[PDB]
Design a protein around this ligand. Structure first.
Ligand SMILES: [Mg+2]
Ligand SMILES: [Mg+2]
Ligand SMILES: [Mg+2]
Ligand SMILES: [Mg+2]
Ligand SMILES: [Mg+2]
Ligand SMILES: [Mg+2]
Ligand SMILES: [Mg+2]
Ligand SMILES: [Mg+2]
Ligand SMILES: [Mg+2]
Ligand SMILES: [Mg+2]
Ligand SMILES: [Mg+2]
Ligand SMILES: [Mg+2]
Ligand SMILES: [Mg+2]
Ligand SMILES: [Mg+2]
Ligand SMILES: [Mg+2]
Length: 154
RNA sequence: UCUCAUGGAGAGUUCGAUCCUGGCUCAGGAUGAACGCUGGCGGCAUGCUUAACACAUGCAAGUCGGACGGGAAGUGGUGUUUC
């Protein structure tokens, strides 16, 4: 999914040397997602490079039986800060462009999110990845703390 | 994987491009609203925000004859009853 297409410029003695930068995320909508960034002379080629760079950068988002987040989380990348919190089933995904495409492509069905701090697409994507990467699923906190699930449930 | 949550979306604009700090602007709701164009019906509401500025006319607080003396309508008369 192509998030953003921009025309960046290098300048040479001749004139303006034009390129396209594409920010693109890939997902299966099944709980596997990644971000990637690419650069080329043509829209198509940059799209493609972005595709590959993403595929080799990819990770997995912890999910809950209802297709949502384990818990509430913040994240920080550059000047982009990102706020995610779990939702009740049937609320859909409500968020802004970068965060929303990332989460939607991960396959998260119900999520609250707001990017605070900056607006830049790319950074917000990476921040979202940082968020959902640090998410701890309950089985694993049970295993870490060394305490049975039902005891933390209460 | 019980319980809680029914809730927080962005976009454009400084640069040859970038990231940022930063303002301006937009998308939403609400009117005791006004104006433009258009306008079939019903249900429930609402209707001088400004000049506590002037007011023509008509009506918005009276009743009690079982507190009381009279007089005035009739009636034949203080037997009747009204104002
Ligand atoms: Mg190279
Ligand atoms: Mg900071
Ligand atoms: Mg914001
Ligand atoms: Mg400047
Ligand atoms: Mg310019
Ligand atoms: Mg700011
Ligand atoms: Mg409006
Ligand atoms: Mg008319
Ligand atoms: Mg008034
Ligand atoms: Mg008068
Ligand atoms: Mg009257
Ligand atoms: Mg009487
Ligand atoms: Mg009387
Ligand atoms: Mg009496
Ligand atoms: Mg008498």
């Amino acid at each position: 999914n192509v998030v953003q297409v921009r025309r960046v410029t290098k300048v040479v003695k001749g004139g303006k040397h034009m390129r396209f930068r594409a920010i693109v995320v890939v997902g299966d909508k099944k709980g596997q997602v990644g971000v990637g960034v690419g650069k080329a002379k043509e829209v198509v080629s940059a799209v493609q490079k972005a595709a590959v760079d993403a595929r080799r950068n990819i990770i997995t988002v912890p999910m809950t039986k209802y297709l949502t987040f384990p818990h509430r989380n913040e994240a920080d990348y550059g000047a982009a800060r990102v706020m995610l919190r779990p939702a009740a089933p049937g609320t859909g995904v409500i968020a802004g462009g970068a965060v929303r495409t990332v989460l939607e492509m991960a396959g998260v069905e119900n999520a609250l999110g707001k990017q605070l701090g900056s607006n830049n697409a790319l950074n917000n994507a990476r921040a979202t990845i940082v968020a959902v990467q640090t998410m701890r699923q309950f089985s694993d906190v049970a295993r870490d703390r060394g305490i049975p699930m039902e005891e933390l449930w209460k």
